[PDB]
């Protein structure tokens, strides 16, 4: 659809949807967060035209990275929780978010960036990888428009945002294997 | 008994007796180690004349600190295992052992120091705290003799060893609450 519809639709969905006791507490944070990401995805123009398999494959591949972006905003200035093994994670999450906040993304930019991250996940296992890619390009097209309407003289603004993607792949490849804990 | 008997007896006992897969592996290291400490204690002249309650009370109070001393030798030069939450522990254990190794204790000195650590544990709960104290003094008496026969010009050698005790109390007070994990 039109660049304006996509921006509007995504931004709206983003606005609406978003001792060892510490480890248990962190551990159960993820369940509602993952469900928030799943609901957001459903509001992304074209996501629910992908096959069930491809939808599910993208969320599995891309949800951790989206959570890295969401934590980013939910961080701080001050900021510990090292002793649970979430040390190098939440400390990696802090440094990433610092970087992200330097861009000073508006809520529309952040919402649309977040959507770009989800559909920019690794595509190993796609039934129709081409459909996933058309969706990615649609979203990146909108993001580029948005960013250039917003800041015409910063022409590498979109470039900087796109550079967050390798970073997210790295955080993903290093920390998605961190252990959670749930009292049986 | 005589200073020579104590040194001999303790030194001998010391010589004779001494992903998440990493966390499980570390976790089960402690069980034989704790049993080694319990057997050592039984060879300490006068330990088994303390009441069962006092014996048990000392091992509970003092075994973690003894393990800190044992790890000390079983460390290295190079040296990771941060991600399990044993980060600030094994890293505290590294710095303590560095300090300990600078003294360059002989095996007799280390053996007798180790015994001093066990019986120098916090005495909250002692049926006969005076008996525990006479034992402590006996062992410190021997250690002082030993250290001064060995290095007569370093007169603060025994002083430096005694300064490891507050350190051990601190490591104890900070890290004894670290979580272990055992597959049920």
């Amino acid at each position: 659809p039109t660049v304006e519809d996509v921006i509007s639709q995504v931004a709206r969905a983003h606005r609406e949807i978003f001792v060892q006791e510490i480890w248990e507490d962190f551990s159960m944070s993820f369940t509602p967060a993952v469900r928030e990401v799943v609901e957001f995805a459903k509001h992304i123009p074209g996501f629910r035209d992908l096959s069930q398999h491809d939808q599910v494959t993208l969320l599995k591949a891309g949800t951790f990275e989206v959570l890295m972006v969401r934590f980013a905003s939910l961080f701080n200035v001050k900021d510990e929780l090292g002793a649970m093994g979430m040390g190098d994670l939440l400390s990696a999450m802090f440094d990433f978010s610092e970087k992200l906040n330097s861009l000073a993304l508006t809520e529309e930019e952040l919402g649309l960036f977040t959507a770009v991250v989800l559909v920019s996940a690794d595509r190993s296992g796609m039934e129709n990888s081409a459909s996933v890619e058309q969706l990615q390009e649609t979203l990146l097209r909108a993001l580029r428009a948005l960013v250039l309407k917003n800041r015409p003289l910063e022409t590498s603004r979109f470039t900087k945002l796109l550079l967050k993607l390798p970073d997210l792949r790295t955080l993903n490849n290093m920390h998605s294997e961190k252990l959670l804990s749930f009292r049986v | 008994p005589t200073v020579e008997d104590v040194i001999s007896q303790v030194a001998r006992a010391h010589r004779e007796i001494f992903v998440q897969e990493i966390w499980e592996d570390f976790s089960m290291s402690f069980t034989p180690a704790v049993r080694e400490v319990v057997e050592f204690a039984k060879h300490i002249p006068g330990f088994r004349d303390l009441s069962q309650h006092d014996q048990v009370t000392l091992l509970k109070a003092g075994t973690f600190e003894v393990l800190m001393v044992r790890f000390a030798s079983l460390f290295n030069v190079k040296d990771e295992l941060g991600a399990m939450g044993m980060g600030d522990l094994l890293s505290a254990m590294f710095d303590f052992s560095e300090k300990l190794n600078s003294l360059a204790l002989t095996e007799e000195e280390l053996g007798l120091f180790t015994a001093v650590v066990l019986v120098s544990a916090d005495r909250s709960g002692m049926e006969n705290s005076a008996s525990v104290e006479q034992l402590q003094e006996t062992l410190l008496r021997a250690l002082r003799a030993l250290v001064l026969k060995n290095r007569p010009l370093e007169t603060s050698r025994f002083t430096k060893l005694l300064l490891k005790l507050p350190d051990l109390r601190t490591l104890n007070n900070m890290h004894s609450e670290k979580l272990l994990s055992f597959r049920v």
């Binding site: 551990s27 993820f30 369940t31 993952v34 469900r35 799943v38 069930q52 939808q55 599910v56 969320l59 599995k60 949800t63 951790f64 920390h175 998605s176 294997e177 961190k178 252990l179 959670l180 804990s181 749930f182 009292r183 049986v184 | 998440q20 994990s181 049920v184």
Partner: peptide
């Protein structure tokens, strides 16, 4: 007792459970 589960495996479980509801 506790269930120890990787952050990645928890994510797939929740996605799977969410799509089966």
């Amino acid at each position: 007792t506790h269930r120890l589960i990787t952050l990645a495996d928890h994510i797939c479980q929740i996605i799977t459970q969410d799509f089966a509801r």
